[PDB]
Design a protein around this ligand. Structure first.
Ligand SMILES: [Cl-]
Ligand SMILES: [Cl-]
Lengths: 289, 289
DNA sequence: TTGTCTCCCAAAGGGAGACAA
DNA sequence: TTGTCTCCCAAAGGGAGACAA
């Protein structure tokens, strides 16, 4: 069940492609992630790759999640999320659990008692256990978390604006995680050169290479199912078409995102204007007509 | 004076070479730092480089120090350090200042008063100010730090085994720093490939490239003055010679550290046995006969 | 010399409804 | 519905010598 926790801490719509399936590796997207004179490398804009391995992991102190993926080029369970408020982080009080959250995720309280209460034990990404006291009190009544909250906010160093996740599997085990609100080993040019050179060798030799996916630090996925890439490139978009991605927008143009470095590429090849003002260049597979 | 603080947080004997001087870039050492199938790159084992720029910096949250250096290949003020003990970090009590520390570093207390005391204001690497109360009390008497200590240990998240630094310049300004007791963006092969490829292009084209120095994460310096490299290579070592580095040892052999990848290199080319048991391969410039 | 303990008084917070958004 | 406030009783800690390493 921890694997389902990892995707929760990552994001609701991450959906990593399944190991052993063909995927489209898009180097320009890999470059955008590790960006959150130089040797130029002649390299294809999409590299169809076999997904050889996925390793999910998390940094214990930072609690951030990342995955190691191994590529070789070729020839639903109940949960809830809440963004933390001031009273949740502040020393006084506890944690206000949303009403919909307690009925669908947390185990159902025995309302015969007064106040209804249970000792909740939850596991985080690294196997630790956290004992929260889940109570039903106040006027008007509300679901709170008291005993373990003060300890939990202090060791995981949460502040307001972050968010906590709770995830119950069909198993008895309850799982908890946190998602924090949004250059120390190599310089940017060296990181740049590294990505493209590993990819260039891997593409020419048809040999294994590896990369790290940071779903939180990733503006858009750069390892997507190869069939999803092919369907969007086959489908013809035209200016003025109506698409969704739920936000709605209109396609204002279709050209290359970078004709100098990455010519002929479908990466962010669509120019769109957003209907509601609340990035104007997106890729074909992200939008749906 | 903050530049002298950076070298304190780095280490006592770091002594970065001065900008504008010729240096010897040793790729194998750069590789050892970022290590704390693959394309092989034909590259020299020492690259004489002009040191174009040094940028000293520090991560605010982690408090770790690193420097960005720009290379182009070609054709004392009073301070004290104390490792933190349990009573220094524990909630009760304060901070015990060593006796030698208060007389040579901290401003001299006015012992006419009772208890002698002063409000100390210190700056860390990032311009912040910390107010400590420096008192002389106890029986037998001792120099302590009280008021600001509890706050300082909690925000900088110090534990036992770390160390605090205090540094007074000739200016009135007092400076404080901490040194903490001893793969999230790129995989190791990609980092490897990046270092060597940036160096290979920079060496062939005689163009600028950059690197990051992590003095705490660095087992031995890999950017050294070019004259220091040349003197040690000119000097002939022989087996059984007596050297110092203060520890004392004997030279047991002289061969290549890696004949396959880095042949003919002077990097860690000396085999030594240590006189006191309390790495047995070192480079010529680190040892002194 | 200095780390660690004990213990005292004040502070800081765990947890409880009271109130509007 | 739920964030925030107030305020009460217990806890946790700031700071002070007392003692050996
Ligand atoms: Cl895992
Ligand atoms: Cl600086």
């Amino acid at each position: 069940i921890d694997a389902e926790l990892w995707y929760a801490c990552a994001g609701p719509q991450k959906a990593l492609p399944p190991v052993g399936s063909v995927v489209a590796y898009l180097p320009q997207g890999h470059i955008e992630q590790v960006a959150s004179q130089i040797p130029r490398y002649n390299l294809p804009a999409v590299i169809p790759c076999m997904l050889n391995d996925i390793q999910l992991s998390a940094d214990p102190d930072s609690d951030e999640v990342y995955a190691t993926l191994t590529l070789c080029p070729m020839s639903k369970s109940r949960s809830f999320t809440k963004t933390l408020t001031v009273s949740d982080t502040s020393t006084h009080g506890g944690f206000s659990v949303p009403r919909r959250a307690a009925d669908d995720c947390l185990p159902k309280l025995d309302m015969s008692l007064n106040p209804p209460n249970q000792e909740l034990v939850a596991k985080d990404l690294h196997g630790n256990e956290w004992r929260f006291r889940h109570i039903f009190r106040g006027q008007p009544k509300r679901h709170l978390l008291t005993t373990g909250w003060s300890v939990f906010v202090s060791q995981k160093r949460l502040v307001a604006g972050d968010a906590v996740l709770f995830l119950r599997g069909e198993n008895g085990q309850l799982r908890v995680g946190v998602r924090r609100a949004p250059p120390k080993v190599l310089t940017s040019p060296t990181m740049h050169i590294g990505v493209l050179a590993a990819a260039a060798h891997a593409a020419t030799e048809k040999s294994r290479f590896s990369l790290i996916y940071n779903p939180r630090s990733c503006p858009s996925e750069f390892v997507i199912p190869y069939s999803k890439y092919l369907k969007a490139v086959k489908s013809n978009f035209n200016v003025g078409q109506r698409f969704k991605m739920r936000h709605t927008g209109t396609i204002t143009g279709i050209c290359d995102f970078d004709p100098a470095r990455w010519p002929g590429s479908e990466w962010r090849s669509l120019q769109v204007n957003w209907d509601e003002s609340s990035q104007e260049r997106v890729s074909p597979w992200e939008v749906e007509p």
